[PDB]
Design an enzyme around this catalytic site. Structure first.
Site, PDB file in Angstrom:
ATOM      1  N   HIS A  41       0.227  -1.553   0.006  1.00  0.00           N
ATOM      2  CA  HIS A  41       0.038  -0.328  -0.008  1.00  0.00           C
ATOM      3  C   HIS A  41       0.667   1.225  -0.035  1.00  0.00           C
ATOM      4  O   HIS A  41      -0.290   2.117  -0.282  1.00  0.00           O
ATOM      5  CB  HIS A  41      -1.080   0.384   1.050  1.00  0.00           C
ATOM      6  N   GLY A 143       3.820   5.269  10.548  1.00  0.00           N
ATOM      7  CA  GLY A 143       5.334   5.157  10.005  1.00  0.00           C
ATOM      8  C   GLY A 143       6.043   4.151   9.970  1.00  0.00           C
ATOM      9  O   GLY A 143       6.423   4.107   9.808  1.00  0.00           O
ATOM     10  N   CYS A 145       4.414   1.492   9.062  1.00  0.00           N
ATOM     11  CA  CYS A 145       4.364   0.202   8.791  1.00  0.00           C
ATOM     12  C   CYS A 145       5.682  -0.043   8.374  1.00  0.00           C
ATOM     13  O   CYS A 145       6.257   0.524   7.888  1.00  0.00           O
ATOM     14  CB  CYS A 145       2.654   0.029   7.230  1.00  0.00           C
TER      15      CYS A 145
HETATM   16  C1  LIG Z   1      -6.830   5.309  21.839  1.00  0.00           C
HETATM   17  N1  LIG Z   1      -7.208   4.565  20.521  1.00  0.00           N
HETATM   18  C2  LIG Z   1      -6.335   2.898  21.168  1.00  0.00           C
HETATM   19  C3  LIG Z   1      -8.165   4.457  19.677  1.00  0.00           C
HETATM   20  C4  LIG Z   1      -7.545   3.003  18.965  1.00  0.00           C
HETATM   21  C5  LIG Z   1      -7.146   4.584  17.347  1.00  0.00           C
HETATM   22  N2  LIG Z   1      -6.487   4.272  16.382  1.00  0.00           N
HETATM   23  C6  LIG Z   1      -6.257   4.246  15.100  1.00  0.00           C
HETATM   24  O1  LIG Z   1      -6.843   5.738  14.938  1.00  0.00           O
HETATM   25  C7  LIG Z   1      -5.391   4.224  13.701  1.00  0.00           C
HETATM   26  C8  LIG Z   1      -6.804   3.773  12.258  1.00  0.00           C
HETATM   27  C9  LIG Z   1      -7.612   2.792  13.309  1.00  0.00           C
HETATM   28  C10 LIG Z   1      -8.878   3.093  12.433  1.00  0.00           C
HETATM   29  C11 LIG Z   1      -9.367   3.893  11.381  1.00  0.00           C
HETATM   30  C12 LIG Z   1     -10.313   4.187  10.268  1.00  0.00           C
HETATM   31  C13 LIG Z   1     -10.910   3.113   9.425  1.00  0.00           C
HETATM   32  F1  LIG Z   1     -11.246   2.699   8.506  1.00  0.00           F
HETATM   33  C14 LIG Z   1      -9.593   1.665   9.973  1.00  0.00           C
HETATM   34  C15 LIG Z   1      -8.952   1.437  10.850  1.00  0.00           C
HETATM   35  N3  LIG Z   1      -6.124   2.517  11.814  1.00  0.00           N
HETATM   36  C16 LIG Z   1      -5.276   3.747  10.713  1.00  0.00           C
HETATM   37  O2  LIG Z   1      -5.257   4.244  11.163  1.00  0.00           O
HETATM   38  C17 LIG Z   1      -4.807   2.581   9.458  1.00  0.00           C
HETATM   39  C18 LIG Z   1      -5.220   3.121   8.195  1.00  0.00           C
HETATM   40  C19 LIG Z   1      -4.974   1.986   7.536  1.00  0.00           C
HETATM   41  C20 LIG Z   1      -4.151   2.506   6.282  1.00  0.00           C
HETATM   42  C21 LIG Z   1      -3.629   1.707   5.872  1.00  0.00           C
HETATM   43  C22 LIG Z   1      -4.429   0.520   5.354  1.00  0.00           C
HETATM   44 CL1  LIG Z   1      -3.659  -1.293   4.329  1.00  0.00          CL
HETATM   45  C23 LIG Z   1      -5.446  -0.095   6.241  1.00  0.00           C
HETATM   46  C24 LIG Z   1      -5.632   1.118   6.822  1.00  0.00           C
HETATM   47 CL2  LIG Z   1      -6.917   0.680   7.802  1.00  0.00          CL
HETATM   48  N4  LIG Z   1      -3.702   3.870   9.424  1.00  0.00           N
HETATM   49  C25 LIG Z   1      -2.082   2.993   9.805  1.00  0.00           C
HETATM   50  O3  LIG Z   1      -2.090   1.893  10.305  1.00  0.00           O
HETATM   51  C26 LIG Z   1      -0.818   3.127   9.759  1.00  0.00           C
HETATM   52  N5  LIG Z   1       0.133   2.636   7.989  1.00  0.00           N
HETATM   53  C27 LIG Z   1       0.283   3.339  10.675  1.00  0.00           C
HETATM   54  C28 LIG Z   1      -0.960   3.930  11.811  1.00  0.00           C
HETATM   55  C29 LIG Z   1      -1.261   5.460  11.796  1.00  0.00           C
HETATM   56  C30 LIG Z   1      -1.512   5.823  12.813  1.00  0.00           C
HETATM   57  C31 LIG Z   1      -2.052   5.395  13.745  1.00  0.00           C
HETATM   58  C32 LIG Z   1      -1.460   3.380  13.725  1.00  0.00           C
HETATM   59  C33 LIG Z   1      -0.262   3.441  13.325  1.00  0.00           C
HETATM   60  C34 LIG Z   1       0.038   2.120  13.145  1.00  0.00           C
HETATM   61  N6  LIG Z   1       0.379   0.895  13.714  1.00  0.00           N
END
Ligand SMILES: CN(C)CCCNC(=O)C[C@H](Cc1ccc(F)cc1)NC(=O)[C@@H](Cc1ccc(Cl)cc1Cl)NC(=O)[C@H](N)Cc1ccccc1C#N
Ligand SMILES: CN(C)CCCNC(=O)C[C@H](Cc1ccc(F)cc1)NC(=O)[C@@H](Cc1ccc(Cl)cc1Cl)NC(=O)[C@H](N)Cc1ccccc1C#N
EC number: 3.4.19.12
Lengths: 301, 301
Positions: A41, A143, A145
């Site tokens: 991705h 960052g 990933c």
């Molecule tokens: C307080 N707390 C415990 C509550 C939870 C809060 N949790 C988040 O807010 C993370 C969110 C949750 C989320 C939100 C909306 C969606 F619709 C899907 C998932 N998830 C991402 O933001 C993905 C979106 C994404 C990107 C790429 C693919 Cl292939 C798939 C997805 Cl789902 N970003 C990554 O994972 C980044 N690459 C790496 C990254 C970035 C930010 C924060 C953590 C990480 C890690 N590790």
């Protein structure tokens, strides 16, 4: 003596971490010989991420779209291909620090070490179990990933996990190094849920044995039980059923302590029905389930 | 997100670990530039260990009594001297993998990463706090002496601990890299006891903040308190008194969550008087006290 959450020494993996940049997206890659592995991705914009078609997106790419940095020294991409959810970038230089290595897929309940990296720079190491619902309870920021999970076995690094995303619940999902996801997840930015989790019974028993080896005995009892009667109490408390091969793996620990597995299952049953009454085991007030029998032996031997 | 016990990447230290052998005693040493550092009790036989006189024992030694192995390649000792409880062996080769480094002494309640080694070979990494009674709750077997504890700061390794012994209670004691013991211990094989330990209050509060940052809020309350009334409840539960500089260090976390330190102290007070009622915080059923405010910020940033 003592019992700590212990990771493998990470230096052999640190020498493999690079920074892969495509467009405005930068994540971590894994440089072994003349190939760099990273999450596919990276070829996605923020709009592509919602519903990508990765064969389309990669077809529209050239080698010069990919910026690879091994520290300050930029690397020359000479080829690119997709392997399920991981991108392979062929570079003109073999990594001189490439260790002996394997790509292996792990089972639920197995543990590994994670080298959390940002912009190709290692920043932290910890231990993780693959949960039964195929997530890991990691510690990962934006960052991270492309960070990898690994075990080490006589200077051979067995790579078993590449980090791809954080689920809405804050748990983490990824693939093996051939790009096959663990669990029913996909690499697109949609709110995906994991199945219901369960406690890894065999690991809890391995940890109870670690406690006895370290001198914690208050939870022991003279009672024993049968394999069938224990599993009745497992399902009530959301514990995996105990198999006979699980008993067999616990063999060496059972031998070293003089406590038959079924004798220790009786103590587990009592802890589940009564709790700990405010007492701790190996510094924890919970039954810990992220140490395998192998991890215990390695630290108690 | 997520919160894990996290160590520093250990590769920069792995490139420094050698095996120091004197007589029939073999332990780990630390090779930086052209000096090897190891625990001085390597010059002791099993009888010397009971009541050694180290100036006598070193005076009766020559450079050729010391076998140093950097892997398979034996190293040539050209000089030797004592620095309190650490032995310095001058070798004919500067370590080409010597990183930028400092020798620093840490305070109680500060954390560091341990690279546990056996026969000069790194085998595991974990995190540790220096307890208030100047012990660490480590994980160490026979052969681990000379293993080092360290922090990393922009590619500079701050070495802060060398492992010397396990106490009868199974906790561990050592020195800084100038050979000064932490706490009232000495390098002789006698049954020494540590003072009574206490909970590191400032760390418990840092960890409560990590919980809020990760979405665990059940323990919060609308109550607040004063600095003086909290410390009254600390001593009753064997917690260190909270200073005003401790509040100041917790400043950034208090800012990032919108929860004043004294507001969070009120929640801590309630948890101490009532326990957790079977609930967990960041995967633990205990108040964890081995994460500093710095560790929390590093993982939550
Ligand atoms: C307080 N707390 C415990 C509550 C939870 C809060 N949790 C988040 O807010 C993370 C969110 C949750 C989320 C939100 C909306 C969606 F619709 C899907 C998932 N998830 C991402 O933001 C993905 C979106 C994404 C990107 C790429 C693919 Cl292939 C798939 C997805 Cl789902 N970003 C990554 O994972 C980044 N690459 C790496 C990254 C970035 C930010 C924060 C953590 C990480 C890690 N590790
Ligand atoms: C179930 N469990 C939790 C109960 C506790 C059992 N715990 C032990 O049996 C370790 C014993 C405890 C002990 C016994 C008699 C004494 F009188 C002093 C200390 N301690 C050692 O055996 C020292 C003696 C010693 C050697 C050298 C100096 Cl300068 C000082 C001392 Cl005290 N050996 C080391 O520490 C080695 N170098 C490294 C080592 C060896 C074996 C095991 C662990 C480690 C470590 N880490």
């Amino acid at each position: 003596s003592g019992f700590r959450k212990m990771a493998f020494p990470s230096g052999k993996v640190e020498g493999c971490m690079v920074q892969v940049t495509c467009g405005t997206t930068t994540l971590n890659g894994l440089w072994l010989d003349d190939v760099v592995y990273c999450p596919r991705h990276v070829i996605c914009t923020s709009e592509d991420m919602l519903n990508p078609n990765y064969e389309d997106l990669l077809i529209r790419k050239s080698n010069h779209n990919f910026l690879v940095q091994a520290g300050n020294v930029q690397l020359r991409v000479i080829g690119h291909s997709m392997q399920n959810c991981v991108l392979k970038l062929k570079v003109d230089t073999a990594n001189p620090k490439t260790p002996k290595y394997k790509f292996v897929r792990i089972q639920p309940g197995q543990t590994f070490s994670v080298l959390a990296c940002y912009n190709g720079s290692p920043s932290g190491v910890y231990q993780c179990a693959m949960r039964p619902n195929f997530t890991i309870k990691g510690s990962f920021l934006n960052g991270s990933c492309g960070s990898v999970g690994f075990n080490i076995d006589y200077d051979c690094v067995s790579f078993c996990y590449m980090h791809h995303m954080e689920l809405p619940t804050g748990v983490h999902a990824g693939t093996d190094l051939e790009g096959n996801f663990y669990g029913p997840f996909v690499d697109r930015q949609t709110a995906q849920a994991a199945g219901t989790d369960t406690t890894i019974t065999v690991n809890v028993l391995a940890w109870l044995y670690a406690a006895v080896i370290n001198g914690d005995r208050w939870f022991l009892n003279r009672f024993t039980t049968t394999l069938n009667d224990f599993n009745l109490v497992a399902m009530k408390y959301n514990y995996e059923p105990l198999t006979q091969d699980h008993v067999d793996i616990l063999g060496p620990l059972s031998a070293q302590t003089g406590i038959a597995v079924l004798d220790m299952c009786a103590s587990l049953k009592e802890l589940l029905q009564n709790g700990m009454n405010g007492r701790t085991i190996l510094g924890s007030a919970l039954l810990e389930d992220e140490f395998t029998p192998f991890d215990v032996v390695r630290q108690c031997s």
